[PDB]
């Protein structure tokens, strides 16, 4: 019943955890506690098998641990800066090669899977700093330039006409812009990792940079030059919707250093590069 | 079923592409690969006819390639400027002879057809530049003056009364103005091209200027003179809705030079005037 | 028009909200899904797999 299912959604009780059943003393030549990790399988032994348990009714749910929930939270993926210092025509616009690799927090989460397929919700948070006292009337234009489309080279470039590309215009004072994007890959899933090259020569590129080109985000302050200089910082937040993930992997253990690569740096004292805290010895808790 | 059709709309699977069927070796005196382009028809041969194909289930759709989709994107068609320099009464209003020929991006797309019929959605993006520091309270008036109606000659002209013409008043701070317009021609379709004149003498006008008169857009800053000077730029965006197009034509190959005319300019080195990149020779890919 | 009452919270951006928003790429049709082994649907699936404990993690 879509209604009963509905109630489960409101209460977040879609995935319940099993109860613990009462168990009793045993004397048998069947030893569940014994197994062989060599097989590659995890011993499925449960509490009832090793101790005398009571009956307990579980009310915990796994809804919040779902992949949709894990990746369904908006996080920052880019901080775009437009700092008008001394040349409005040059400093009033910029561009960014889109990717989800510049901010560790969300990058690490997605990278716990090998492949993932999802729709995206983008929310933008622009903040105008009045460097000289006034901000006047700020209007912004965020244009998505898919790979191949002409990238504007000046604040009045014809490409800003956006005759086909999708552009979003925001007016200072109005609520934060937000829009959705469908799964964009030319493949069936996004590659979080890619053990391949774009060629077979010593100079061929390696990794996700070969497969994850998302194009460019071009921004510009639509308003023409004003007396008072401003610094506009637009933070882009991303959230995955209708998510699917495949082949889980270990979490990143060391800091990230670059985009599209698993490269890392190690100091002379490696224990400082990982979250593992040295133990005094084996018996010191 | 309007509901099944609805699902197709949400999923964008209204126009599906055919599958590829398995094919086999052939030895026949019927040669599909051979034909005669002289006829003017394109040889309808498909992959299954020239190689041994496997069966493949297509999931591609042509929805996005529809005429409604191609022309249904809002693009800039005009940038109106009101720059208060030294005379408020003269610089606080202006006029524009409406047309879709001033911006190359959308012009080129519409011009891929000979005739087109559509409704229009106009969205305006005004941005007020505080030249002297403050913008005060800006209120704009955009009045549509159909051919024949009196065009205002001063910022207080009686014509601004808009007793009949449609006017749109925007208040700085409020969301971007937007309205729709029905197909406006006195004919059944708009002429994207017109091999005709408005007379039969050496001085008769030629081209779409004869048939595409849309009137005038008159703007003015309603607010009376303020201490601080401002520069108001209003960008007009246009989008075609409920579109129909006839007789496709080749895309514009050289830059546009003027409105309502196919005129162009050629340099001494023509290869620079077209997008064709010179080849080293016939066998250099 | 229909009289409305704007409620507190309006216009805010909560990173964990769950609203809808217009799609920037209308008519676009995503690439067909293919079968890929190893789909994970819930993190509990990963908590149920044995991993090694760096129990002897003394500084040396």
């Amino acid at each position: 019943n879509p209604v009963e299912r509905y109630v489960d959604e409101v209460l977040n009780e879609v995935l319940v955890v099993p109860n613990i059943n009462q168990s009793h003393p045993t004397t048998s030549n069947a030893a569940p506690v014994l197994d062989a990790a060599e097989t590659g399988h995890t011993n499925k032994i449960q509490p009832e098998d090793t101790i005398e348990t009571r009956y307990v009714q579980s009310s915990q749910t796994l809804d919040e641990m779902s992949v949709e929930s894990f990746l369904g939270r908006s996080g920052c993926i880019h901080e775009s800066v437009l700092d008008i210092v001394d040349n409005y025509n040059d400093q009033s616009f910029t561009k960014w090669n889109i990717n989800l690799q510049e901010m560790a927090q969300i990058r690490r989460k997605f990278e716990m899977f090998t492949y993932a397929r999802f729709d995206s919700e983008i929310t933008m948070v622009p903040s105008v700093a009045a460097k000289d006292g006034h901000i006047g009337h700020i209007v912004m234009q965020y244009m998505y330039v898919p790979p191949g489309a002409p990238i504007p080279t000046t604040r009045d470039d014809y490409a800003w006409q956006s005759g086909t590309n999708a552009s979003v215009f925001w007016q200072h004072g109005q609520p934060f812009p937000r829009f959705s994007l469908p799964f964009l890959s030319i493949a069936s899933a996004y590659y979080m990792f890619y053990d391949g090259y774009d060629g077979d020569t010593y100079k061929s590129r390696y990794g996700t940079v070969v497969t994850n080109d998302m194009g460019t985000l071009c921004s510009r302050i639509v308003t023409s030059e004003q007396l008072h200089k401003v610094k506009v910082v637009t933070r882009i937040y991303h959230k995955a919707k209708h998510t699917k993930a495949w082949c889980p992997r270990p979490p990143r253990a060391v800091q990230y250093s670059h985009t599209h690569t698993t490269n890392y740096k190690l100091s002379s004292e490696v224990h400082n590069d990982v979250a593992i805290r040295p133990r005094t010895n084996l018996t010191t808790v | 079923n309007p509901v099944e059709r609805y699902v197709d709309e949400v999923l964008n699977e209204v126009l599906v592409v055919p599958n590829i069927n398995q094919s086999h070796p052939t030895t026949s005196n019927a040669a599909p690969v051979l034909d005669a382009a002289e006829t003017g028809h394109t040889n309808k041969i498909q992959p299954e006819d020239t190689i041994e194909t496997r069966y493949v289930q297509s999931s591609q759709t042509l929805d996005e390639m529809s005429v409604e989709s191609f022309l249904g994107r809002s693009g800039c068609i005009h940038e109106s400027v009101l720059d208060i320099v030294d005379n408020y009464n003269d610089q606080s209003f202006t006029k524009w002879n409406i047309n879709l020929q001033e911006m190359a991006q959308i012009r080129r797309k519409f011009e891929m057809f000979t005739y087109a019929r559509f409704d229009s959605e106009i969205t305006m993006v005004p941005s007020v530049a505080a030249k002297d520091g403050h913008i005060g309270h800006i209120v704009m008036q955009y009045m549509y003056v159909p051919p024949g109606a009196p065009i205002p000659t001063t910022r207080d002209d009686y014509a601004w009364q808009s007793g009949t013409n449609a006017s749109v008043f925007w208040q700085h701070g409020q969301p971007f103005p937007r309205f729709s317009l029905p197909f406006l021609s006195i004919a059944s379709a708009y002429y994207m091209f017109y091999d005709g004149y408005d007379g039969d003498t050496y001085k008769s006008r030629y081209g779409t200027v004869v048939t595409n008169d849309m009137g005038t857009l008159c703007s003015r800053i309603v607010t009376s003179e303020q201490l601080h000077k401002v520069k108001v730029v209003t960008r007009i965006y246009h989008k075609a809705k409920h579109t129909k197009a006839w007789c496709p034509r080749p895309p514009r190959a050289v830059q546009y030079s003027h409105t309502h005319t196919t005129n162009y300019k050629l340099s001494s080195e023509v290869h620079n005037d077209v997008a064709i990149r010179p080849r080293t020779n016939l066998t250099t890919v | 028009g229909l009289p409305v009452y704007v409620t507190p919270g309006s216009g805010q951006f909560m990173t964990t909200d769950d609203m809808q928003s217009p799609c920037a790429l209308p008519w676009y049709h995503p690439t067909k899904e293919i079968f890929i082994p190893g789909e994970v649907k819930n993190l509990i699936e990963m908590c149920q797999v044995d991993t090694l404990i760096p129990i002897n993690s003394t500084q040396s």
Partner: peptide
């Protein structure tokens, strides 16, 4: 786009835009 259920406790799973990407978080399992 209204998925009206009834039980009375009526459910209205409305989809305000015509693209699937536009809808909110997915249901589970």
């Amino acid at each position: 786009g209204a998925q009206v259920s009834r039980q009375s406790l009526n459910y209205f799973n409305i989809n305000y835009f015509k693209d699937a990407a536009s809808s909110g978080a997915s249901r589970l399992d």
